[PDB]
Design a protein around this nucleic acid. Structure first.
Ligand code: CMP
Ligand code: CMP
Ligand code: CMP
Ligand code: CMP
Lengths: 200, 200
DNA sequence: GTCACATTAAT
DNA sequence: ATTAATGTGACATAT
DNA sequence: GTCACATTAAT
DNA sequence: ATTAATGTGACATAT
């Protein structure tokens, strides 16, 4: 993309090791990010530390954009590297200037914000309409469709901790274990620790 | 605002009576809206008709924007007039042209989308971290802060059905009634049908 | 779900 | 070696 | 929460 | 008049 390589030429690339935190919730937002390589997890915490993953973001996604349209904004969530990342970065101020010379870069940003509101809205619906089992089931099918999913004779095989499934759907690690077990007894999946074969 | 009156001069104003539906979920998105007067409710439904209110939008808010950044998009939710509305409307195509002559109008749009992602994300957190009572309690305090809230010697008085509270927080009408009653026994509110006095 | 431990994976 | 995850049965309620 | 009715508000 | 909301006690489970 012509608009992207141009935008990236005004950015300073930073690398982050896996598991590090790129953005800290509560801090002043003055910088925009863009994932050149790798993936991250956007998450929020309650008053007592419980974590909920709002979304995963990968190659080609902007991050830290919510503070751009108004002064004195704080990061709305935490962002941690899921894999080692290579992230381009640029101050809001300089980005606002590129928007003036070319509004097409703001168009790329908004396209993702729109998509984010659509998917976060769908997550509101899952938390309100589906029980924990329905939410886990849907999560498993989503993961089984992803790129990093391995092929298997009876479906697709995925690797994930019960802690992270619990963080995505909103339940304890113990609850995830009990439901995985129930889905297995129904012959819908095969669970062996962190390995899950989703039949299909 | 100079940019707004200009943008609105390329829009065609339509009026809608209260309770009517401005946008239908599932339909082709080819038009952008903007509330000149009145308020609406953005909502989603499950497979069996249960409704969840994602947000209320008022004077000065854009609507129908999620389909703008990609062809063949469908409305992601339902939008109904909460009060009689006066809504400016414009095709995506013409709006895209105004964006080129002036990118500041896209800046106004994105500011709201960002704000929407922040508040919808906070709603994800409420559904995941707070029990029904906590969600109702928070809802009551929010309503008591709003413009249409009436003053009262012991706090603020609000009018709302138990059906709508249930639609905002994600519980049955019967559940709302039982929790309102419990909050009253704790002297936190005074509930007389649709009238709620939030003490504070 | 939380709790209290007992068992196991994982670096 | 230790640290990061798990597995379990008993429970107290909220949904 | 859902269910089955009995009671009441609201136009 | 009717239609739109509610109020209730008994329950079956999921959280
Ligand atoms: N619901 C969400 N989905 C995806 N990304 C999000 C979501 N909420 C916040 N973010 C991202 O996480 C970032 C946290 O800091 P900012 O608010 O600056 O910008 C935010 C977005 O880039
Ligand atoms: N409603 C919730 N109840 C419990 N844990 C939750 C909830 N929402 C998110 N979580 C998180 O998901 C995690 C799943 O594994 P843990 O039990 O280690 O810790 C849990 C919390 O950090
Ligand atoms: N979470 C949300 N908060 C606020 N407005 C929303 C939300 N989800 C959808 N909308 C609005 O409702 C509209 C439904 O149709 P569109 O998807 O075209 O555009 C959507 C937005 O204008
Ligand atoms: N999880 C949920 N359970 C029940 N009703 C819900 C839920 N989420 C949203 N709702 C809606 O909220 C409404 C509250 O009043 P009702 O019982 O008439 O109907 C309910 C549904 O339309």
């Amino acid at each position: 993309d012509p608009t992207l390589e141009w935008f990236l030429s005004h950015c300073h690339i930073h690398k982050y090791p896996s598991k590090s935190t790129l953005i800290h919730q509560g801090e002043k937002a003055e910088t925009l990010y863009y994932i050149v390589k790798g993936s991250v997890a956007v998450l929020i915490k309650d008053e007592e530390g419980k974590e909920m993953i709002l979304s995963y973001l990968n190659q080609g996604d902007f991050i830290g954009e919510l503070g751009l349209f108004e002064e004195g904004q704080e990061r709305s969530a935490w962002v941690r590297a899921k894999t080692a990342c290579e992230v381009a970065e640029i101050s809001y101020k300089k980005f606002r200037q590129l928007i003036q010379v070319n509004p097409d870069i703001l168009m790329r940003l908004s396209a993702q914000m729109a998509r984010r509101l659509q998917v976060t809205s769908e997550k509101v619906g899952n938390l309100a309409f589906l029980d924990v089992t329905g939410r886990i089931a849907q999560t498993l099918l989503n993961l089984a469709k992803q790129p990093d999913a391995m092929t298997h004779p009876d479906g697709m095989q995925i690797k994930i901790t019960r802690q992270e499934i619990g963080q995505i759907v909103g339940c304890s690690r113990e609850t995830v274990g009990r439901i995985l077990k129930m889905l297995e007894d129904q012959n819908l999946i095969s669970a062996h620790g962190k390995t899950i074969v989703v039949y299909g």
